[PDB]
From Swiss-Prot, chains B, J:
Protein name per UniProt: Proteasome subunit beta type-1
GO biological process: proteasomal ubiquitin-independent protein catabolic process; proteasome-mediated ubiquitin-dependent protein catabolic process
Catalysis: reaction(s): Cleavage of peptide bonds with very broad specificity
Family listed: Belongs to the peptidase T1B family.
Miscellaneous note of the record: The side chain of Thr-1 acts as a nucleophile, and the N-terminal amino group acts as a proton acceptor.
UniProt keyword annotation of Cell inner membrane present: no
Pfam families listed in its UniProt record: Proteasome
Species, as recorded: Saccharomyces cerevisiae (strain ATCC 204508 / S288c)
Swiss-Prot record, chain C:
Subcellular localization, as worded in the UniProt entry: Cytoplasm; Nucleus
Subunit record text: The 26S proteasome consists of a 20S proteasome core and two 19S regulatory subunits. The 20S proteasome core is composed of 28 subunits that are arranged in four stacked rings, resulting in a barrel-shaped structure. The two end rings are each formed by seven alpha subunits, and the two central rings are each formed by seven beta subunits. The catalytic chamber with the active sites is on the inside of the barrel.
TM ranges: none
GO cellular component, one term: proteasome core complex, beta-subunit complex
Keyword Cytoplasm attached: yes
Function: Non-catalytic component of the proteasome which degrades poly-ubiquitinated proteins in the cytoplasm and in the nucleus. It is essential for the regulated turnover of proteins and for the removal of misfolded proteins. The proteasome is a multicatalytic proteinase complex that is characterized by its ability to cleave peptides with Arg, Phe, Tyr, Leu, and Glu adjacent to the leaving group at neutral or slightly basic pH. It has an ATP-dependent proteolytic activity.
Keyword Mitochondrion among record annotations: no
Taxonomic lineage: Eukaryota, Fungi, Dikarya, Ascomycota, Saccharomycotina
Name of the molecule in the record: Proteasome subunit beta type-6
Swiss-Prot record, chain G:
Portion of the full sequence shown: 76 to 287 of 287
Reaction equations catalysed: Cleavage of peptide bonds with very broad specificity
Superkingdom per UniProt: Eukaryota
Keyword set includes Metal-binding: no
Molecular function GO labels: endopeptidase activity; threonine-type endopeptidase activity
Summary of the function given for this chain in its UniProt record: The proteasome degrades poly-ubiquitinated proteins in the cytoplasm and in the nucleus. It is essential for the regulated turnover of proteins and for the removal of misfolded proteins. The proteasome is a multicatalytic proteinase complex that is characterized by its ability to cleave peptides with Arg, Phe, Tyr, Leu, and Glu adjacent to the leaving group at neutral or slightly basic pH. It has an ATP-dependent proteolytic activity. This unit is responsible of the chymotrypsin-like activity of the proteasome and is one of the principal target of the proteasome inhibitor bortezomib. This subunit is necessary for chymotryptic activity and degradation of ubiquitinated proteins.
Binding positions (bortezomib): A49
Family: Belongs to the peptidase T1B family.
Primary location class: cytoplasm
Protein name as annotated: Proteasome subunit beta type-5
Active site (record annotation): T1 (nucleophile)
Gene name of the encoded protein: PRE2
UniProtKB/Swiss-Prot annotation, chain H:
Extra remark beyond the main annotation: The side chain of Thr-1 acts as a nucleophile, and the N-terminal amino group acts as a proton acceptor. Present with 11400 molecules/cell in log phase SD medium.
Section of the entire sequence shown: 30 to 249 of 261
Quaternary structure note: The 26S proteasome consists of a 20S proteasome core and two 19S regulatory subunits. The 20S proteasome core is composed of 28 subunits that are arranged in four stacked rings, resulting in a barrel-shaped structure. The two end rings are each formed by seven alpha subunits, and the two central rings are each formed by seven beta subunits. The catalytic chamber with the active sites is on the inside of the barrel.
Catalytic activity: Cleavage of peptide bonds with very broad specificity
Name listed for the protein in its UniProt record: Proteasome subunit beta type-2
EC number of the protein: 3.4.25.1
Enzyme class at the top of the EC tree: hydrolase
The keyword Hydrolase is annotated on this UniProt entry: yes
Length: 125, 196, 222, 232, 203, 187, 212, 220, 187, 196
């Protein structure tokens, strides 16, 4: 298979692919999250696309990973869909194995672990 | 076991090996498988030792009673007495018997009673586990009206080959000669028949 | 239709003292009713003052002993020559046995040595891998004969003070190594008298803080 | 192997004060048929070791091939192959026992019983046994299968303890071995009159005698045996 | 195995001029204790018999031997001796060679004329085992063998013989799941017989 | 099959399940009065139990008529044990377990015997056949006293029956004492 | 073999016997039938000794790893789930295991889960497992209460084990007691069955059918 | 068990071991395996001990009655025939393997009988689980003409080989010698090469150690 | 194992026995809410049933989260049938029988499905698994009407439960309708 | 089946019968059991027909590859390839094979591979169900350095006896002669060998 080391170290100690992924995040639309006394608010910006866009069926950025946990993103949309699917599968698996829904920190740690694994594995970006 | 009986010009000759086995162990190096049932009527026994011995005892008893009542029984009568016991008790016994007899009129006669209890009259008969290996040789070498020396040589060669190839047969070669002159016993040791 | 297992007979016994341990074994090896050898030791010193015996199917026992010795060697390699204690050896042997849960070694295992407090220690292992620390434990063909005698003589079972109307049990005392040796010899001579597979010789390994020493005695060859 | 087809009989051996003696007959039997005559079942590995094999003949030939391969592999990149780096009986037995036990663990055994005999470099005798289950043991006298029931009682008459080994000369040991072979030919129905013997001595070299025949037997008394029980 | 259904053990030892026979008291079906008062020892005059095995066969053999000993006394005008009673037991057992009683009988007594203690054991088909030291039978036979080969001494006074046989019985029964719910010992001299009930762990 | 018995100071109480085993709607009685002071309850394979019980009852009634005398409960138990021991060796053995309750008039005492299909007879203060023992013996061991009266024995039996009903309907209860054999109707 | 565990206002009481048998011969009377998984969890032993020991030690390792990862004490439901999933992975191989996992957490309270080698996993209040479970369960049913004090609960467990050991041939030897509270499990000792029988007979007046 | 029979110049000697076991457990360490059919006719039996004893006793009783009837001393062939027919009638279900030897007015005789009824005639015979070692010794050392002393030594050596090398055989050696013109000589424990050594201590308990609940006197 | 279901004009009623396999003192529930309007009850070999039910529930909840939509009862039944049909061919098949109750919101109608361990799916007005059918079908055939209300179906179920209790304790009763899934407390 | 191979002064001769049976029914009166694997290396097959045919095909393929790569294989090499196939697959195959070859240096050679997968080099070899009946005769009649006519007569007599006594063998007698002059085929009909 294809297992080339795409993410490697530069002479100054930087990993260029991670920095370029951060630039890709910079190109994405702007998302915001604020904490309240007893609530969390997520705001997202819609791109000023054509007026012929159908709002009913387009994906709406903010995705419920579980009935108590939501996720928003900024960057490439399809990669975000992949991460969202992995998070949903992991949430269901955890609820199955431990007879309790995931904590927010646990799901965040799982998603961050997936991202780190892609930063360190070969043949992927 | 390798037993046989051969008719020849002057009478009949029975021959046998002497090995009894209980599997791989030789429980008796020196066994006598040639059992007399009447003065000039003998038998070669193969199969279960207990069954053949009991049958031979009963046949000898019946033939003694026949002799006391009716006179000297013929070889055919002795074969018939063996056949009755073998056939009527075939579901409980394992016995292959060769009956060989002499009389003045018929000279020598041989009858074979294999498993099942049927009787077959033959110019010569062979039986036992080691018989299978000499079916050809004997068929290629048997003649009729042979002299005593030729018959002895034929039996010796056949039994030596049977002993050589069969693990259940061995020991010494025993022979009994029934003629008008009477009964003669012969024995041949391995150093004699292994050079053949 | 192959039957990869066998029996091989044999009888072993382990006894733990206040400051010593004893592991004794018969030296007779048999198949069914024939004697393969009259001197085939089954008790070995597996380093770090630990003695071991796996009685039963001889091939499985030899394989297990070889594996445990190799395990001791690699434990020394991987942990800066640290001494392997007796409880750790018991756990490692449990894992070695349970590694063949569905094709087990057909042996009963006994190991002996000193614990970290200097006291004697004996561990017993079933073929599957369960283990326990016991004061006295016999294994093999004649275990059912030996065990009640040691229950009576070591633990003073069913013995009372002569005059208390069976209200005061005979108090326990700490046996010396010589008394243990005498009890072992008597048990094995009785077993030789009554059990067909026991005889020929007896070999005893004694473990103290000074190390491991061996003694041999003759049993009736018939 | 799940069932043997062509099989050899027992191999017998004993230690004496200077070396070891081993012997086995030259018959390959096929289910009560004495089919093959002239099968050598003693394999000399070098000058200080003899391996005697009983059981399936095909597995025996496989083992012979393995031993030859082992010798060839030992000779590679070893200028001391005919010296202190030569193969020893202990090495050969350990290898064979490993093979037997591994193949038993795979439910595909080599249906054999093997005696390795020889003399170590320091001069000590070596004699050990391993079978198709991987069971191994050593004794001053060794025999497998049928011989284990009849050869061992006779040989243990000569060498009953380890203390009897220094008292046993080569002549006494060889006479005992020959007598045991004669007894086996008397009472074993799967045995042959022709056998081979090997003597490994610490002072002299390996002596391999072939075409040995069981000598003068006692058969005359058979002429006195009449029919069973009451005949004559 | 019918012999290992109900359980139970019997021992017998010889003293100086005395004999001793002891038994356990348990009667269970398979692993449930049914009765703790099932004695396996009976006596016909001065001869004592202890039977292990199926409880039904034990009772049947006791009744049959009582029958035969009563008839023997009526015909002979004297009590039967242990040596002749042993032959009687052997013949009675061998008369059922193919439908055998699953029993473990043991005979202990003292010959009236000679005064010598006598002891014997039987298998289920009547093979006689004569011993000068001891006889054991039951589900804990191996444990009893181990205890007896170690504790027994060739000549003991009845007071010492009591302790020896009692300890052997108790320590063999504590290692047998199917044996032990009480224990009885008989010490038999020429002119006196003493019966003692031992204290035991029960379970 | 619930067959249970408790012997108290002056009497014997037997309890037998009033159930059968299909489809029918009855109140089976598994006891036979062998004699005016001896009762037998049975359990086991259907058919064999009734036949064996009737055979025993007929023989005992015949003996009572012949001698104009009542056999003691001990003799009755011995006769039943002999019959079962003979049966176990026969071509078609009886697969029947029995409890025999009686009141010996000569000794003026109650007696309870338990016999199984093999022929093992035991005299007990309390006994059971089947699975009743496994669920009843803890209570019987804890609460039994040899000097209990009839009411105390009935109360203990009621507790035992309730315990049996916990892990399952109704029982028939018989009392044997100096006045003979009676059936409890308030239970 | 007899093992039992029950819950009450004071926590959990676990009581086991100590006899192991290999047919008719008693191999051992000093068997430990309570697995000390960790200082807050206990697991009983029944069926195969090796399977119970090995897999409950492995369960202790898994609970330790969980507490390292999540920085909280694991739930008894989660540990029993781990064990049940593992044994279900092996169903049909030949494992023999019927165990009670007993614990006490702040959120759940006192909790007992019975886990079998067939994949069964039941939350319960009173469990009795073994060849002598009938007598012990009868005693417990007759005498169980929620408001039992610690001493009464320990005595009830001991009495149930004694009742089972008296009648069951393959049960006995000694009684091992354990009390499980919020702060962990407390060992309450080993009591010889033979002495306990006589002491109980004297104090209660029971077992009148046994001559003492 | 190991049992042997050897002929010599003027008689026959049988020999046996004295161990009887039930599996791997020794049931009797000193058992008699030489049975007297008649004063000069002795049988040694292996296999089932009860069968051997009962069959020898029955045949001996019948032989004694026959001898009284005929006013003649019993013959070995008569005992052989009666044993053979009794064993053949039961089709091997009686597990007795016998070596029958004796002296009668016709001479000295030695026969072997199997459980199915087969019989063999030989100068030297062995039977039992240790028969292979004994037969090895016999084939090694038997000679055509032997004196009484040599025959006794050879039979004892064969029994000793069975004792040493066979697990089911051991303890002592019992011998019986029958000579043509002499009385039968039965030597019980002719050799006792297995004497247990002294124990390391004495286990005699002090009086009062065993707890007792009740005591009573039994009227015999 | 009592698993029973009755579909009436506006709802589905499921009844499951509360008992387990021994010695313990609990209130076992053998149902899993697959979705706010779809419930599943199961019976069969212990261990397999709970694992299978949890697997199905997890997959259905995952689909509901992914699509932000609730599958119809027909699609759920088809998915369960496919899983069982795959299982029957596997190395370790599930020995589980299920009843699925639902209220289709699009068609606004109740639906009841019965599937066995082989994978045989049938839609029925009433169904059962085990021996409940053999003792319940006479009453169900005589009394059922497709236009029954909630109370009438509850009464019919009560009669069925009493019939089951006649030839044996208690059942758990669940109702699925337009308002979702609820448990009956007065039963 | 009755197959044999005999070495003689000028080379080797293989011989076989031609009967194939499916129990009591003769499924093929005329079978060729002599299979060529190389120009002067042939084999006699006995046992399962499918197994022996597949083994012979594989051996012929391997020997063709050997010839293309390394040159003319020896008889010992062909026997070794046969042995590898039989021994490594002995748990699934039933094949008794006699390998007979000729070469200029070693003249004629015969190897036997019975069931199990062992190889034995012999001056002559016999195999099959009907071999048992001629173990004696052949042992009594085989010589060394026989002429071609004597070898043909020996094989003919032996196979005629084997056919006579064995129910699983019969038909015609096929023979293949391997010598320096090459390969020759011979056939003998029942009216020829039944008069012997």
């Amino acid at each position: 298979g294809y297992d080339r080391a795409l993410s490697i170290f530069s002479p100054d100690g930087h990993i260029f692919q991670v920095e370029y992924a951060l630039e890709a995040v910079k190109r994405g639309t702007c998302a915001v999250g604020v904490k309240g006394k007893n609530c969390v608010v997520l705001g997202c910006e819609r791109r000023s696309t054509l007026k012929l866009q159908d709002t009913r069926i387009t994906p709406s950025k903010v995705s419920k990973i579980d009935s108590h946990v939501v996720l928003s993103f900024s960057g490439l949309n399809a990669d975000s869909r992949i991460l969202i699917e992995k998070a949903r599968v992991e949430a269901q698996s955890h609820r199955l194995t431990l007879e309790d829904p995931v904590t927010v920190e646990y799901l965040t740690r799982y998603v961050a672990g997936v991202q780190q694994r892609y930063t360190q594995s070969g043949g992927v970006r | 076991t390798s037993i046989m009986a051969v008719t020849f010009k002057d009478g009949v000759i029975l021959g046998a090996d002497s090995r009894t086995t209980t599997g791989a162990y030789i429980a008796n190096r020196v066994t006598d498988k040639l059992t007399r049932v009447h003065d000039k009527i003998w038998c070669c026994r193969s199969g279960s030792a207990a069954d053949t011995q009991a049958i031979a005892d009963i046949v000898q008893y019946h033939l003694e009673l026949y002799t006391s009542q009716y006179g000297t029984p013929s070889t055919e009568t002795a074969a018939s007495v063996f056949k009755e016991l073998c056939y009527e008790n075939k579901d409980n016994l394992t016995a292959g018997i060769i009956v060989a007899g002499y009389d003045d009129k018929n000279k020598g006669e041989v009858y074979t009673i294999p498993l099942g209890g049927s009787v077959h009259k033959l110019p010569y008969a062979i039986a036992g586990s080691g018989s299978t290996f000499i079916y050809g040789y004997c068929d290629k070498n048997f003649r009729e009206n042979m002299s005593k020396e030729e018959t002895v040589d034929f039996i010796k060669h056949s039994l030596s080959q049977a002993i050589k190839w069969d693990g259940s047969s061995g020991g010494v070669i025993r022979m009994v000669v029934l003629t008008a002159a009477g009964v003669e016993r012969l024995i041949f040791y391995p150093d004699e028949y292994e050079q053949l | 239709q192959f039957n990869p297992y066998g029996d091989n007979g044999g009888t072993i016994l382990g006894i733990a003292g206040e400051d010593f341990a004893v592991l004794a074994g018969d030296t007779r090896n048999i198949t069914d009713y024939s004697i393969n050898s009259r001197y085939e030791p089954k008790v070995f010193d597996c380093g770090d003052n630990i003695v071991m015996s796996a009685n039963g199917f001889a091939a499985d026992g030899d394989a297990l002993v070889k594996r445990f010795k190799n395990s001791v060697k690699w434990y020394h390699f991987d942990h800066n020559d640290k001494k392997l204690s007796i409880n750790s050896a018991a756990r490692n042997i449990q894992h070695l046995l349970y590694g063949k849960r569905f094709f087990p070694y057909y042996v009963h295992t006994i190991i002996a040595g000193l614990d970290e407090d200097g006291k004697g220690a004996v561990y017993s292992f079933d073929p599957v891998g369960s283990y326990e620390r016991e004061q006295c434990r016999a294994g093999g063909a004649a275990a059912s004969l030996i065990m009640p005698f040691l229950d009576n003589q070591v633990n003073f079972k069913n013995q009372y003070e002569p005059g208390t109307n069976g209200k005061v049990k005979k108090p326990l005392k700490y046996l010396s190594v010589e008394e243990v040796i005498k009890l072992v010899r008597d048990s094995f001579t009785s077993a030789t008298e009554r059990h067909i597979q026991v005889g020929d010789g007896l070999e005893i390994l004694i473990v103290t803080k000074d190390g491991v020493r061996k003694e041999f005695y003759e049993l009736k060859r018939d | 192997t799940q069932q043997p087809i062509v099989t050899g009989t027992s191999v017998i051996s004993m230690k004496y004060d200077n070396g070891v003696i081993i012997a086995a007959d030259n018959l390959g039997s096929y289910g009560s048929l004495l089919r093959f005559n002239g099968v050598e079942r003693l394999i000399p590995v070098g000058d200080n070791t003899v391996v005697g094999i009983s059981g399936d003949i095909s597995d025996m030939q496989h083992i012979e091939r393995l031993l030859k391969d082992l010798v060839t592999e030992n000779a590679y990149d070893n200028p001391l192959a005919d010296a202190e780096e030569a193969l020893e009986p202990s090495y050969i037995f350990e290898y064979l026992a490993t093979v037997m036990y591994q193949r038993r663990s795979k439910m595909n055994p080599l249906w054999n019983a093997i005696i390795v005999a020889g003399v170590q470099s320091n001069g000590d005798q070596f004699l050990r046994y391993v079978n198709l289950l991987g069971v191994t043991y050593s004794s001053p006298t060794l025999a497998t299968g049928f011989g284990a029931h009849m050869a061992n009682p006779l040989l243990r008459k000569v060498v009953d303890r380890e203390s009897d080994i220094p008292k046993t000369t080569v002549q006494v040991a060889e006479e005992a071995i020959v007598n045991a072979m004669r007894v086996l030919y008397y009472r074993d129905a799967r045995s042959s009159r022709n056998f081979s013997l090997a003597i490994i001595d610490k002072n002299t070299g390996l002596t391999f005698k072939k075409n040995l025949q069981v000598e003068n037997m006692k058969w005359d008394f058979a002429k006195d045996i009449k029919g069973y029980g009451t005949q004559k | 195995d019918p012999s290992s259904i109900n359980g139970g053990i019997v021992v017998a030892m010889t003293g100086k001029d005395c004999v001793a026979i002891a038994c356990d008291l348990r009667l269970g079906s398979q692993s449930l204790g049914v009765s703790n008062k099932f004695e396996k020892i009976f006596h016909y005059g001065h001869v004592f018999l202890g039977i292990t095995g199926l409880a039904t066969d034990v009772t049947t053999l006791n009744e049959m031997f009582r029958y035969k000993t009563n008839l023997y006394k009526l015909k002979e005008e004297r009590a039967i001796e242990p040596e002749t009673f042993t032959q009687l037991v052997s013949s009675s057992l061998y008369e059922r060679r193919f439908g055998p009683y699953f029993v473990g009988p043991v005979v202990a007594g003292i010959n009236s004329k000679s005064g010598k203690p006598f002891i014997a054991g039987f298998d289920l088909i009547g093979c006689i085992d004569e011993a000068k030291d001891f006889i054991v039978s039951g589900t804990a036979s191996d444990q009893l063998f181990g205890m007896c080969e170690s504790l027994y001494e060739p000549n003991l006074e009845p007071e010492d013989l009591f302790e020896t046989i009692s300890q052997a019985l108790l320590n063999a029964a504590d290692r047998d799941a199917l044996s032990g719910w009480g224990a009885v010992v008989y010490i038999i001299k020429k002119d006196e017989v003493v019966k003692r009930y031992l204290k035991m762990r029960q379970d | 099959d619930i067959i249970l018995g408790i012997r108290v100071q002056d009497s014997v109480i037997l309890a037998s399940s009033k159930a059968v085993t299909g489809i029918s709607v009855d109140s089976d009685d598994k006891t036979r009065q062998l004699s005016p002071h001896t009762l037998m309850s049975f359990a086991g394979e259907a058919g064999d139990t009734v036949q064996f019980a009737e055979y025993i009852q007929a023989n005992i009634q015949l003996y009572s008529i012949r001698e104009d005398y009542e056999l003691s409960p001990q003799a009755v138990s011995s006769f039943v044990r002999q019959e079962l021991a003979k049966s176990i060796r026969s071509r078609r053995p009886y697969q029947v377990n029995v409890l025999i309750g009686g009141y010996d008039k000569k000794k003026n005492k109650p007696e309870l015997y338990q016999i199984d299909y093999l022929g093992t007879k035991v005299e007990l203060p309390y006994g059971a056949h089947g699975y009743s023992g496994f669920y009843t013996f803890f209570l019987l061991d804890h609460h039994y006293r040899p000097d209990m009266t009839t009411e105390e024995g009935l109360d203990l039996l009621k507790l035992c029956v309730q315990e049996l009903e916990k892990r399952m309907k109704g029982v028939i209860v018989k009392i044997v004492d100096k006045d003979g054999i009676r059936q409890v109707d308030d239970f | 073999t007899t093992t039992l565990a029950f819950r009450f206002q004071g926590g959990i009481i676990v009581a086991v016997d100590s006899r192991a048998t290999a047919g008719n011969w008693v191999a051992s009377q000093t068997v430990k039938k309570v697995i000390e998984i960790n200082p807050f969890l206990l697991g009983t032993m029944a069926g195969g000794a090796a399977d119970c020991q090995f897999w409950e030690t492995w369960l202790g390792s898994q609970c330790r790893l969980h507490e390292l990862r999540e920085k909280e004490r694991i739930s008894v439901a989660a540990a029993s789930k781990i064990l049940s999933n593992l044994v279900y992975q092996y169903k049909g191989a030949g494992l023999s295991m019927g165990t009670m996992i007993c614990g006490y957490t702040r959120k759940e309270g006192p909790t007992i889960y019975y886990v079998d080698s067939d994949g069964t996993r039941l939350k319960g209040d009173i469990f009795c497992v073994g060849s002598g479970q009938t007598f012990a369960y009868g005693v417990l049913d007759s005498n169980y209460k929620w408001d039992l004090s610690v001493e009464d609960a320990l005595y009830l467990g001991k009495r149930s084990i004694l009742a089972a050991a008296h009648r069951d041939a393959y049960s006995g030897g000694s009684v091992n007691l354990y009390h499980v509270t919020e702060d962990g499990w407390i060992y309450h000792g080993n009591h010889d069955v033979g002495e306990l029988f006589w002491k109980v007979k004297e104090e209660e007046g029971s077992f009148n059918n046994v001559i003492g | 068990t190991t049992i042997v029979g050897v002929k010599f110049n003027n008689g026959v000697v049988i020999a046996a071991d004295t161990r009887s076991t039930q599996g791997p457990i020794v049931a009797d360490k000193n058992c008699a395996k030489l049975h007297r059919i008649s004063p000069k006719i002795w049988c040694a039996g292996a296999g089932t001990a009860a069968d051997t004893e009962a069959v020898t006793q029955l045949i001996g009783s019948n032989i004694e009655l026959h001898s009284l009837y005929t006013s003649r001393e019993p013959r070995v062939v008569s005992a052989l025939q009666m044993l053979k027919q009794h064993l053949f009638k039961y089709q091997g279900h009686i597990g007795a393997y016998l070596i029958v030897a004796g002296v009668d007015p016709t001479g000295s005789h030695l026969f072997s009988i199997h459980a199915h009824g087969s019989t063999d005639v030989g100068y030297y015979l062995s039977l039992g689980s240790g028969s292979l070692a004994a037969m090895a010794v016999l084939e090694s050392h038997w000679k055509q003409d032997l004196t009484k002393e040599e025959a006794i030594k050879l039979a004892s050596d064969a029994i000793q080989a069975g004792i040493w090398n066979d697990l089911g055989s051991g303890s002592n050696v019992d011998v019986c010698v029958m000579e043509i013109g002499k009385d039968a000589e039965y030597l019980r424990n002719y050799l006792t090469p297995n004497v247990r050594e002294e124990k390391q201590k004495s286990y005699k308990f002090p009086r009062g150690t065993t707890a007792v609940l009740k005591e009573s006197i039994v009227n015999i």
